[PDB]
Structure 1
Amino acid sequence: RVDVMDVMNRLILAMDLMNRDDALRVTGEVREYIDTVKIGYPLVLSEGMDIIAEFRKRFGCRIIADFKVADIPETNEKICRATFKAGADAIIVHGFPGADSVRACLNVAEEMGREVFLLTEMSHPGAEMFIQGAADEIARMGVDLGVKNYVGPSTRPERLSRLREIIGQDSFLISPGPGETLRFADAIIAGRSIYLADNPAAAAAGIIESIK
């Protein structure tokens, strides 16, 4: 679909390393295979928000800030603004704080010409307590607000088809990575499988092969 982001090879790198030298090194080597890198707070809090612009300049990649924004609207607005001012192309936001908190992010994204991803669900064991039960309603909330981009877990293929049902065929959906997953998700996210490999470029190339 034309109005949603084009992710090279349908593979996003989750660059979760906390030191700038390793992150830059492991990443530089895969820019041939990947054009979209997800960075989170472990790296940005350790090395500074300036690292976002550094990735974009050195690699020419799109940056998704995996900040799991989860505050009141006024604070959400400020987080999104600081993050986009630092150069992030997109930001991942929690839905559990409700519609006004999500809308706060959408407002800034619209102003600055950037993207908001709604995190609908999580796959770690504790997700069962509150998150799993809210996931469908969170997804519908996003749809009802015109959210275009979503993050969903891949540890359950039947969970992905359900999400895809809710958000429709036009929405952009990313999930952890893979053959089954991409029946539903537009792109898969790879972290350790790549950044802890001796030849990250090789590890990336491999995944992409299985993707064809």
Structure 2
Amino acid sequence: MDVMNRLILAMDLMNRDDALRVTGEVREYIDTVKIGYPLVLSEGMDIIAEFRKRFGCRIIADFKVADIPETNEKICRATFKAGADAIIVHGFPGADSVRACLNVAEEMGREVFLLTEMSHPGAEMFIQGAADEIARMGVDLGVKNYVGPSTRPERLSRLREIIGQDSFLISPGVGAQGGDPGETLRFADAEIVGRSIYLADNPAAAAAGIIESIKDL
């Protein structure tokens, strides 16, 4: 997966006008957009096709899929029908729930990203202690795409170790949550950035600044 500038925009603005304007302003720097529930629940699933029409970008649906297998299958089907290229799935609910997502992705020509450890402080309570095992589960299931935390580079490095160099790894928590752009890319193929860009006084300059800081990466 060729992600331009190793930078994925987390487009969590909640109105269509702002989301489209800001994405347009940074389009020269980014060809992959992560669209999540803040935008989708505010503006509808049709927003995914609109992003493809306007920007011709890759779309990762960050839906943190975390239901039973039967419901997961339905969520993935609805998501891929809307034109998402990939979907993010939690590992904590177990292997059957992940497999349900893998099945639909194969059927529709899409990718599953397995979220293993999260970036926020609460992740330490339950998720972190399960995360290595969740990653091994991903490997056992044939998962090739993973999400791990910029905010804990030692944990991000461990995730990379488990999954190997061939697997694809993206990482949120850069900027607003404290993760460093350059350090994150020691381990992740691409980093996810939301507020540091979309809440910036000048989103284009913010994106440009981030890329300048990782220029030699």
Q: Using structure 1 for the length normalisation, give the TM-score.
A: 0.96
2:156, 2:125 → 1: CA distance?
19
2:121, 2:30 → 1: CA distance?
30
**Aligned residue pair count:** 207
Residue 100 of structure 1 corresponds to which residue in structure 2?
Answer: 96
When the two chains are superposed, the root-mean-square deviation of aligned CA atoms in Å is: 0.7
Q: 1:199 Cα shift?
A: 1.6
Runs of 4+ with deviation above 3 angstroms: none
Q: 1:156 Cα shift?
A: 1.3
2:55, 2:148 → 1: CA distance?
26
Deviation per residue, 1:4-39 (Å, 9 max, x gap): x11011000000111111000000111100000001
1:42, 1:64 → 2: CA distance?
14
Q: Residue 116 of structure 1 aligns to a residue in which SS? A: strand
Q: 1:123 Cα shift?
A: 2.0
Report the identity percentage. Answer: 99
Q: 1:127 Cα shift?
A: 1.3
2:45, 2:166 → 1: CA distance?
32
Q: 1:161 Cα shift?
A: 1.1
Q: Residue 14 of structure 1 aligns to a residue in which SS? A: strand
2:55, 2:204 → 1: CA distance?
14
1:180, 1:201 → 2: CA distance?
22
Deviation per residue, 1:154-177 (Å, 9 max, x gap): 11111111001100010000012x
2:200, 2:2 → 1: CA distance?
26
Q: Residue 68 of structure 1 aligns to a residue in which SS? A: strand
Q: 1:40 Cα shift?
A: 0.6
**Structure 1 range deviating more: 35-44 or 119-128:** 119-128
Deviation per residue, 1:91-148 (Å, 9 max, x gap): 0000011001000000000010001000001121221221011000000000111100
Q: 1:198 Cα shift?
A: 2.1
Q: Does 1:205 align with 2:208?
A: yes
Residue 30 of structure 2 corresponds to which residue in structure 1?
Answer: 34
Q: Residue 189 of structure 1 aligns to a residue in which SS? A: strand
Residue 181 of structure 1 corresponds to which residue in structure 2?
Answer: 184
Gaps of 5+ in 2: 173-180
5 Å-filtered alignment, 1:134-173, equals 134-173=130-169
Q: Using structure 2 for the length normalisation, give the TM-score.
A: 0.94
Q: 1:84 Cα shift?
A: 0.3
Q: 1:43 Cα shift?
A: 0.7
Q: Residue 180 of structure 1 aligns to a residue in which SS? A: helix
1:29, 1:161 → 2: CA distance?
33
